[PDB]
Ligand binder design. Structure first.
Ligand SMILES: [Zn+2]
Length: 134
């Protein structure tokens, strides 16, 4: 016996599958990092079916705002959808809102980048130690 979700939402231009709101309780746990979700800390959910538990079917998971971004592609979040389109965002506080906008700029062509690394640059003999045998 657990209080179920009331069937009666008011939205016209909002995405259902995607919803964001304050973590009412610290019961749920993220799967991207496998870490409990501290109460109060903003959180989001995505309507999808668990591959490990097909019996349940259409379920609702939860992932920290930071995980939602990193796994924005893996989860299946297209650029056509922004943070302002997250059920609840509008309700959230401006301060928090911007926090999500700065993370999910919506449409943007972001590409991977590479830097540099050491090749060797070995020098003449120097003072060092050595392993031991048996
Ligand atoms: Zn997480």
């Amino acid at each position: 016996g657990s209080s179920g979700s009331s069937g009666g939402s008011k939205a016209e231009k909002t995405l259902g599958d995607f919803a964001a709101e304050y973590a009412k309780s610290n019961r749920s746990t993220c799967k991207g990092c496998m870490e409990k979700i501290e109460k109060g800390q903003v959180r989001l959910s995505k309507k999808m079916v668990d591959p490990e538990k097909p019996q349940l079917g259409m379920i609702d998971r939860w992932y920290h705002p930071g995980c939602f971004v990193k796994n924005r592609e893996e989860l299946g979040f297209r650029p056509e959808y922004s943070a302002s389109q997250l059920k609840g965002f509008s309700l959230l506080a401006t301060e928090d809102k911007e926090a999500l906008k700065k993370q999910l700029p919506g449409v943007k062509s972001e590409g991977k980048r590479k830097g540099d690394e050491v090749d060797g640059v070995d020098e003449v003999a120097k003072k060092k130690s050595g392993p031991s045998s048996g």
